[PDB]
Design a protein around this nucleic acid. Structure first.
Ligand SMILES: Nc1ccn([C@H]2C[C@H](O)[C@@H](COP(=O)(O)OP(=O)(O)OP(=O)(O)O)O2)c(=O)n1
Ligand SMILES: [Mg+2]
Lengths: 394, 545
DNA sequence: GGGGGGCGCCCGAACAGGGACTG
DNA sequence: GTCCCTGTTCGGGCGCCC
């Protein structure tokens, strides 16, 4: 087992991200996990002469078993670049397996190890941080699926041969396994595969697209119509084909907001055609892998979240709704982000970049307390115009 | 003695070479201090005489330690530091006595001449060349003034204690540079045995622990505190009293106060900080400032201590509102027995309100409890459950406060007004708008109402966004206690809908006052320039420029 | 006096990004 | 495009510790 040379993109240095503070539970786990990882030569201690760093934390999946998670998002951004089944988004049942432990068997190019440095904090800073670095393929680095792809093919080959109707997709530490089996059939197949690999659960078709939908009411006020004309004027951008002139003609004069306005039969019908121009599928939007998926999320209230995935403005690839319930917005929002990412990995095998409707600090204070994925999407924080959140309302 | 620890491999940043800098002149008292230090270090192989093989040089001086007596040799490696590689600092923060658990037996140890006990990489010794005015030396150990030295010592120190720690998992050793706090649950004699094991472990690795810096009895002096067996205290904080404060003087007073606020409840520095908006510049105190300064001065006069941490109990944090974006908090487990205290006062956002700020405070404290005790505390907040509920409904953002309980202790945090969700029947409807000329900076704000009232106000040295905020202000100014306002300004609608009670903006403040006075307000938005009446009529009125 | 690393606090400077505007 | 305004980060003082 000799190593594959790996480069950083040209004109790019390795990551230098400060570790954030961890809870006692998480540190206790990381220290225990790292000890064992060091015993098995999988990681080595390093000093401060290594100038690179990358955060670590840990998630507890009802278990007694923690999972180390290294936030390699910078390193991935900085690593020299390296199979997508359209049939995976159709399976009645898709299961997600953690094949991250597979990478610890392949060593890692000695000249690259320095960029995988991470640091473990101590409670109350009783000690300096303890710095490690990887000697094998790290979980969460985008290099590890690449290097191991060759081996990964050899392993699933007979399982794919024997089950040519089952589709197996790999993204990072993850193995997506989709079948058209009644549940139990599929389950017994999943444990057939995992037992086969020592030697819960998804349903991609019951996924929903959330249309833009217009109010239906029998008497309209000036306020009603003004909100309506505002909603359509913006949807004009997404769907060319939506018209406001006839409705906007009812707002002639300077009327009181609560005045009721009889709908002229022109405007009554124009409002009808628009309704259908919303249900008609959006036109002219081709998934480009050379540009990243942007995802916007909007808080609709009462545990309702809307989202849109697009690569260019108003050119949506998908638009959805995520519904929940001591309600916790941060918990719900990260559950949404994991839900949207998963759907995105399934459909286009690329992770989206989230525009998050939350204060940066609030998000960084709590998101890891509800993270359950082995990957971490990139994200940025936005103060969303309270207009957009009404556009997608149900 | 020099540690037999492996040196840490260090290099210069590429394409650069070591420092060549004239040795500035020194006091005679300092030269005797330095030759005293150098002649000794040189006999111990800590420094080595060099020749003309070594082109480099870097200035040296010496300051007195805390001790009254001994000198600390230093080296202005500012230049070599520019040219040395990057290190990853491993010291992630500062241990806090409030995070210490109660121990049956405690010891504080300091290492003798710590840096000079850790060897420096051979290939790098050249660049540490210096001159005592007159002999020329280089360092074989870590110099004090190099930027590599702290991370290297800390890491080296950590390696050295790793064996002792694994062998003695239940002896706790807080490790700050060379300072060690060692705690055990052992009877005094079994502890003293363990300490002697430690000191000899250190000695084997070349780090001595002189009995002079070996504390055996309470109260222990540690990290700037006195540690008693049941309580801890900060070593006295003495504020200046210069009755003609300068920007430097202020900064030292703000600094001592923030440091003080960790255990002193009620410290405020808003009015002091406000003052400093170069360092020799004298500034006149404001009334608000000196009134504050005196309040703090009265606070510091009182006697106060902290307690240690019992992990069997809860962490409770209660927050007091201090006014003008200021907040104090007290973290405790048993009532009136503080673990520590603190202040939040950061102004962030041109416009904000007290619930945002409370949420920011909760966040800071959460992060800080997580560092210190490794867990989140339970909160006691001066905000009614209904107030928060309203805000978490009204707000278009994800926002959250962890487990918490209300506390009747005023000033209670409130929402100072609530925009209506639906338009108000029997309320004059204002269509406002503003336009401003980019070139001339002249502009107009004004409105048109469903009752036939129209008004335009001309403005000078204004901007588009300003004219839209002005139009809304104008409508609030001329409306009853109940008003429907229709704006096309996404900007203005976004600010006001966030329900601020404070602003950097005088104008938004004037607006906030109006919104608080009103009894029902409703803000609707419409798209601009689309013939929408009567946004249309007010647009023509206002756009004559 | 003057050097270093860490954390903290405040401030102001750059720069990033969305919206409104000129024709 | 430009200008405006808002948010972030980063670097500079100071505090404290070694
Ligand atoms: N102003 C200071 C204080 C300390 N240090 C560093 C180098 C010191 O060796 C180490 C520990 O500081 P001490 O005050 O304990 O000093 P020493 O250990 O060198 O000396 P002593 O024998 O007096 O303890 O931290 C520094 O660079 N600058
Ligand atoms: Mg010492």
């Amino acid at each position: 087992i000799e190593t594959v040379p790996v480069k950083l993109k040209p004109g790019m240095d390795g990551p230098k991200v400060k570790q954030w503070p961890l809870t006692e539970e998480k540190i206790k786990a990381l220290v225990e996990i790292c000890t064992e990882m060091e015993k098995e030569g999988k990681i080595s201690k390093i000093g401060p002469e290594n100038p690179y760093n990358t955060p670590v934390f840990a998630i507890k999946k009802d278990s007694t078993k923690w999972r180390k998670l290294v936030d390699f998002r910078e390193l991935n951004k900085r690593t020299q670049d390296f199979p997508h089944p359209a049939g995976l988004k159709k399976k009645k049942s898709v299961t997600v397996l953690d094949v991250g432990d597979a990478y610890f068997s392949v060593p890692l190019d000695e000249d690259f190890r320095k960029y995988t440095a991470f640091t473990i904090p101590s409670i109350n800073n009783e000690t300096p941080g303890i710095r490690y670095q990887y000697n094998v393929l790290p979980q969460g680095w985008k290099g590890s699926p690449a290097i191991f792809q060759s081996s990964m093919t050899k392993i699933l080959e007979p399982f794919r041969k024997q089950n040519p109707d089952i589709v197996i997709y790999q993204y990072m530490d993850d193995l997506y396994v989709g079948s058209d089996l009644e549940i139990g059939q599929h389950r017994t197949k999943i444990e057939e595969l995992r037992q086969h690999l020592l030697r819960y659960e998804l349903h991609p078709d019951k996924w929903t697209v959330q249309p833009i939908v217009l109010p239906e009411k029998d008497s309209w006020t000036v306020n009603d119509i003004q909100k309506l004309v505002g909603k359509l004027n913006w949807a004009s951008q997404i769907y060319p084909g939506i018209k406001v002139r006839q409705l906007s003609k009812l707002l002639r004069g300077t009327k009181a907001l609560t005045e009721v306005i009889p709908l002229t039969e022109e405007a009554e019908l124009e409002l009808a055609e628009n309704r259908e121009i919303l249900k008609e599928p959006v036109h002219g939007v081709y998934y480009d892998p050379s540009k990243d998926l942007i995802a916007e999320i909007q808080k609709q209230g009462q545990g309702q979240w809307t989202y849109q995935i697009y690569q260019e403005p108003f050119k949506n690839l998908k638009t959805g709704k995520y519904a929940r319930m001591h309600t916790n917005d941060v918990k719900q929002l990260t559950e949404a982000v994991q839900k949207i990412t998963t759907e995105s990995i399934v459909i286009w095998g690329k992770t989206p970049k989230f525009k998050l409707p939350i204060q940066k600090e609030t998000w960084e204070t709590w998101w890891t307390e509800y993270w359950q994925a082995t990957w971490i999407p990139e994200w940025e924080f936005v103060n969303t115009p309270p207009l957009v959140k009404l556009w997608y309302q149900l | 003695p020099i540690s037999p620890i492996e040196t840490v491999p260090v290099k210069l940043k590429p394409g650069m070479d070591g420092p060549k800098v004239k040795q500035w002149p020194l006091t005679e008292e300092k030269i005797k201090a330095l030759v005293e230090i150098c002649t000794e270090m040189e006999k111990e192989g800590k420094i080595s005489k060099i020749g003309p093989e070594n082109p480099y040089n870097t200035p040296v001086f010496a300051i007195k330690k805390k001790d009254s007596t001994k000198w600390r040799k230093l080296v202005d490696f500012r230049e070599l530091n520019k040219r040395t590689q990057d290190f990853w600092e491993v010291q992630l923060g500062i241990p806090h006595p409030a995070g210490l658990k109660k121990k049956k037996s405690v010891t504080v140890l300091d290492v003798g001449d710590a840096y000079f006990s850790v060897p420096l990489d051979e290939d790098f010794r050249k660049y540490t060349a210096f001159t005592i005015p007159g002999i020329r030396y280089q360092y074989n150990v870590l110099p004090q003034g190099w930027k590599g030295s702290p991370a290297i010592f800390q890491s080296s120190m950590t390696k050295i204690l790793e064996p002792f720690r694994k062998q003695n998992p239940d002896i706790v050793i807080y490790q700050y540079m060379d300072d060690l706090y060692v705690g055990s649950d052992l009877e005094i004699g079994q502890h003293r045995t363990k300490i002697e094991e430690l000191r000899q472990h250190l000695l084997r690795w070349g780090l001595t622990t002189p009995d002079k810096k070996h504390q055996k009895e309470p109260p222990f002096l540690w990290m700037g505190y006195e540690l008693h067996p049941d309580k801890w205290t900060v070593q006295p904080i003495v504020l200046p009293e210069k009755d003609s404060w300068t920007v430097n003087d202020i900064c030292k007073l703000v600094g001592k106060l923030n440091w003080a606020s960790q255990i002193y409840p009620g410290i405020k520095v808003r009015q002091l900080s406000k003052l400093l908006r170069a360092l020799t510049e004298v500034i006149p105190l404001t009334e608000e400032a000196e009134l504050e300064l005196a309040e703090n001065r009265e606070i510091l006069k009182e006697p106060v201590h902290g307690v240690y941490y019992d992990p069997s109990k809860d962490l409770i944090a209660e927050i007091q509102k201090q006014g003008q974006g200021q907040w104090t908090y007290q973290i405790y487990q048993e009532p009136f027995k503080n673990l520590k205290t603190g202040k939040y006062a950061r102004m962030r956002g041109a416009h904000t309100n007290d619930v945002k700020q409370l949420t920011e405070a909760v966040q800071k404290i959460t992060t800080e409890s997580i560092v210190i005790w490794g867990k989140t505390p339970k909160f006691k907040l001066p905000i009614q459950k209904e107030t928060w509920e309203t805000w978490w409904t009204e707000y278009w953002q994800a926002t959250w406060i962890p487990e918490w309980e209300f506390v009747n202790t005023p000033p209670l945090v409130k929402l100072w007004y609530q925009l209506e969700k639906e338009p108000i029947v029997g309320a004059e409807t204002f269509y406002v708008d503003g336009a401003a000329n980019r070139e001339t900076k002249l502009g107009k704000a004004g409105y048109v109402t469903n009752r036939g009232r129209q008004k335009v106000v001309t403005l000078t040295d204004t901007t588009n966004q300003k004219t839209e905020l002005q139009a809304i202000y104008l409508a609030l100014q001329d409306s009853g206690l109940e008003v429907n306002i229709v704006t096309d300004s996404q900007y203005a609608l976004g600010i006001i809908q966030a329900q601020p009670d404070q602003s950097e903006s005088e104008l938004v403040n004037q607006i906030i006052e109006q919104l608080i006075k009103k009894e029902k307000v409703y803000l609707a938005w419409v798209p601009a320039h689309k013939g929408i009446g009567g946004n249309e009529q007010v647009d023509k009125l206002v756009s004559a420029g």
